[PDB]
Amino acid sequence: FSFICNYFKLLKRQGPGSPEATRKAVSFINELTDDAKIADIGCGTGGQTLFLADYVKGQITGIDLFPDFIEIFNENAVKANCADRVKGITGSMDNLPFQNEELDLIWSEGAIYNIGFERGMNEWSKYLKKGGFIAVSEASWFTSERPAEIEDFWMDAYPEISVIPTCIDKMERAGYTPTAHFILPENCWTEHYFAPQDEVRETFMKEHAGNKTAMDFMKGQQYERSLYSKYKDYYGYVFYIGQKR
C-alpha cells in the first residue's frame, strides 16, 4: 500500500458510511458521561470518529495501523476543537493498548475485516466493561444466493463475508446481546464514498496518467463502483451493535 495510502489520506472517509449511519448506531447504546472511555478501531483519518464525538460523551481514542492517518486524525481534532477528548494513536488491531474492562464503547467502521468479524468480536470483548457496547459496520450478504461475479470478488477480497444471521450468531457466541443491526443506506456508498473519489479523479489522472501500477489501481476503484452499481441488492455494509453480557 505504497501510494495507495497516500491516496486515501486525501479523502474525508476511507470507507462507506455517513453522519446519519454513525448517529443511528449510537441511538442503540446507553448515554455516556465525560468519564466514559471510547475506542474507534481502524479509525483511518477519523472521519467517522468526529461524527461520533458529536453524538456521545467521553474520551475517544482512535487507533489505526497507518501513522500518516493518525497524523491527519490529530490535525482534524485540533481544527475541530476537541483534541483534548479525541486523540489518535498508531496501533495494531490484534494488539490493542487497553486494559481489561476499561472501555465503555468499542467503535469500528469498515475495519474489523482486517482481523475477521468473529476473531475481532471475541478478542475485543476483553477490553469492554460489563454492560459496555460494541458497534461495528461490516460487509455482509443480504441473501442466501447471489451472482457468481460479485461472489468471486468478495470470496477473494474478504472470505469471511457472510449473511446477516451468521454475523449475529457470532455476536452471541462472543457473549454479546444482539442489541441491533441495520443495513447502511446506499448514499453511504455513493455520496459519501464513491462521489468524493470522483472529485479528485481528474487531478489524479493527470499526475499518474503515465504510471501503470497507479492506473491499475484506478481500474480497481472503478470496478468496485461497477460491482456496487449492479449488485447493491445482494450485499453492502451492515452496522452491528451488541452489549457485553
Give me the residue whose beta carbon is nearest to ligand SAH.
44
- The C-alpha cell at 227 is 460491482
The correct pick among 14, 76, 162, 197 for binding ligand SAH (CB under 6 A) is 14
Please check whether residue 111 is in contact with residue 93, taking contact to mean a CB–CB distance below 8 angstroms: yes
Instruction: Please say which residue, 104 or 109, places its beta carbon nearer to ligand SAH.
Output: 109
- The C-alpha cell at 207 is 499526475
Helix (H, G, I), strand (E, B) or coil at 129: strand
- Minimum Å gap between C-beta 22 and ligand SAH is 9
- Minimum Å gap between C-beta 99 and ligand SAH is 18
Q: Does 110 bind ligand SAH (CB under 6 A)?
A: yes
DSSP 114: G
Residues between 129 and 148 that touch ligand SAH (CB under 6 A)? none
User: Is residue 215 a known part of a binding site?
Assistant: no
**13-28: b (≥16 Cβ within 10 Å) or e:** bbbbbbbebbebbbeb
Instruction: Please say which residue, 15 or 132, places its beta carbon nearer to ligand SAH.
Output: 15
The correct pick among 44, 58, 88, 242 for binding ligand SAH (CB under 6 A) is 44
Amino acid at 48: Q
Helix (H, G, I), strand (E, B) or coil at 158: coil
How many whole angstroms separate alpha carbon 227 and alpha carbon 158? 15
Integer angstrom CA distances of residue 234 from 39, 139, 151, 229: 31, 11, 9, 11
* Cα–chain center distance at 198: 21
Interface characters, 61-100, with ligand SAH (x: CB under 6 A): --xxxx--x----------------------xx-------
- Minimum Å gap between C-beta 137 and ligand SAH is 7
- Minimum Å gap between C-beta 158 and ligand SAH is 12
Residues that bind ligand SAH (CB under 6 A): 13-15, 17, 42-44, 47-48, 63-66, 69, 92-93, 109-111, 114
Binding residues: 13-14, 64, 93
